[PDB]
């Protein structure tokens, strides 16, 4: 049985190929005073220094990443990695040296019999039953637009936006404090993250919603804190994820996700653009806000020629789309010869990844 590991900036999603979901999902955090990983590192944070080995989807601390992988194999999946072919995922535009490093560690440290690296956004498109479309992938650290044609991403047209879940959590903290409460500490950050995931939504028309919020209490919701206190959240519910469409909310001069999507499509060959417009696939935890698909449909419609057929696809399981695509791919009868084997690695070294894995 093959393994599938999807490493993100905020969360590791890991499991077995052929399963419909990852069996292990945990924070991508390593703590040192001789090391703790994930939830156990968070609960003991007062006595250690915490580090995130993945920043904006890219691995930047290889010592800490090895610990993430060790913990995944032994503590979470409880496997002997030397027994299992392992599929890993990577960010769009992952540097060549990083790909090689990933390969080196898997074969030389964990001694896997076989490995493969796949682009996250491409796996999500496959999971939606598509070979052509544009993916909006938004997680905890980074947001990408990735146009894909007949199975393969178009590198020149990929857009990166350094605004995701973490920033939205921090912003909700700020505007709840401005409302009258006080959310500031690291323990209060975890509470706000839960409020975000439970109560936030995207307004179809933001200014209309801001008017409804000030004239009525129909959009207000109550949330019980862990100490027992009950708070009321009003326009903050939709103002938080509006930041995705209006990055100026947190002082960013970047275009919103609707504009980056349009921009990405417009960088692609004119003959494929229609297929892109009709296949906008959303993936990642930060696309989980209710109403996001309806709003994107509205915004892209306003940007495109009036006769353009536009469709936004937002699968309920899109938190795990990348992982599920990997599970499907690694399970295929045809995938057996696509793995990089230990033998092939011994013959060719780490550069084999550039020839075997697009």
């Amino acid at each position: 049985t093959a393994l599938v590991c999807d490493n993100g900036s905020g969360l590791v999603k890991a499991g077995f190929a052929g399963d419909d979901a990852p069996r292990a999902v945990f924070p991508s955090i390593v703590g040192r005073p001789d090391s703790y990983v994930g939830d156990e590192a968070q609960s003991k944070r007062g006595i250690l220094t915490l580090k995130y080995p993945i920043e904006h989807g890219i691995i930047t601390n290889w010592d800490d990443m090895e610990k993430i992988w060790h913990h995944t194999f032994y503590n979470e999946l409880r496997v002997a990695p030397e027994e299992h072919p392992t599929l890993l995922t990577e960010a769009p535009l992952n540097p060549k040296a990083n790909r090689e490093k990933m390969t080196q560690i898997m074969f030389e440290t964990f001694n896997v019999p076989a490995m493969y690296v796949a682009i996250q956004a491409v796996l999500s498109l496959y999971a939606s039953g598509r070979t052509t479309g544009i993916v909006l992938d938004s997680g905890d650290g980074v947001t990408h637009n990735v146009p894909i044609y007949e199975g393969y991403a178009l590198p020149h047209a990929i857009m990166r936006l350094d605004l995701a879940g973490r920033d939205l959590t921090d912003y909700l903290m700020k505007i709840l404090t401005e409302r009258g409460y006080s959310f500031v500490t690291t323990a209060e950050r975890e509470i706000v993250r839960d409020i975000k995931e439970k109560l936030c939504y995207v307004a179809l028309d933001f200014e209309n919603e801001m008017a409804t919020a000030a004239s009525s209490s129909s959009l207000e919701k109550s949330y019980e804190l862990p100490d027992g206190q009950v708070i009321t959240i009003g326009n903050e519910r939709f103002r938080c994820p509006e930041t995705l469409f209006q990055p100026s909310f947190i002082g960013m001069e970047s275009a919103g996700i609707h504009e980056t999507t349009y921009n990405s499509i417009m960088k692609c060959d004119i003959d494929i653009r229609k297929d892109l417009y009709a296949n906008n696939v959303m993936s990642g935890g930060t696309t989980m806000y209710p109403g996001i698909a309806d709003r994107m449909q509205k915004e892209i419609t306003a940007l495109a020629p009036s006769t353009m057929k536009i469709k936004i696809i937002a699968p309920p399981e899109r938190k795990y789309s990348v992982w599920i695509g990997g599970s499907i791919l690694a399970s295929l009868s045809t995938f057996q010869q696509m793995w990089i084997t230990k033998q092939e690695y011994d013959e060719a070294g780490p550069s084999i990844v550039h020839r075997k894995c697009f």
Binding site: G18, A21, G129, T131, T132, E150, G151, I324, I328, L329
Partner: protein
């Protein structure tokens, strides 16, 4: 190296496979046109070119009740088959009830739907 890849697009005509538990399985020629709505299929139409070469259109057909592993596999198999044919196939996504005119054209007595199909390849978590 997959047996069915070796057989794909050797001569003009129509070839149909069904996604069955992460594998591509040939559909009996007598059963062409009768699609299980709980399943996904890969269809290759091969046309003789005047130039001696062959023209390839790959269509992946997705039944209303097919499982995520089946629709996912049908799409990936399509990419892999296209790659195997040196990129020369044109890929088409065909959704039950919304199939293209050319796809519907392949079945001279008209395509029909039937409820049911093969079980999912996924292990449930």
């Amino acid at each position: 190296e997959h047996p069915e890849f070796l057989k794909a697009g050797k001569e003009p005509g129509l070839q149909i496979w069904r996604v069955e538990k992460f594998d591509l399985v040939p559909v009996p020629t007598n059963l062409y046109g009768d699609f299980f709505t709980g399943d996904a299929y890969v269809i290759l139409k091969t046309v003789q070119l005047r130039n001696g070469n062959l023209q390839y259109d790959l269509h992946y057909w997705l039944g209303n009740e097919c499982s995520q592993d089946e629709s996912g596999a049908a799409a990936i198999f399509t990419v892999q088959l296209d790659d195997y044919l040196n990129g020369r196939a044109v890929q088409h996504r065909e959704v039950q009830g919304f199939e293209s005119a050319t796809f519907l054209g392949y079945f001279k007595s008209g395509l029909k739907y039937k409820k049911g199909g093969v079980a999912s390849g996924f292990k449930h978590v």
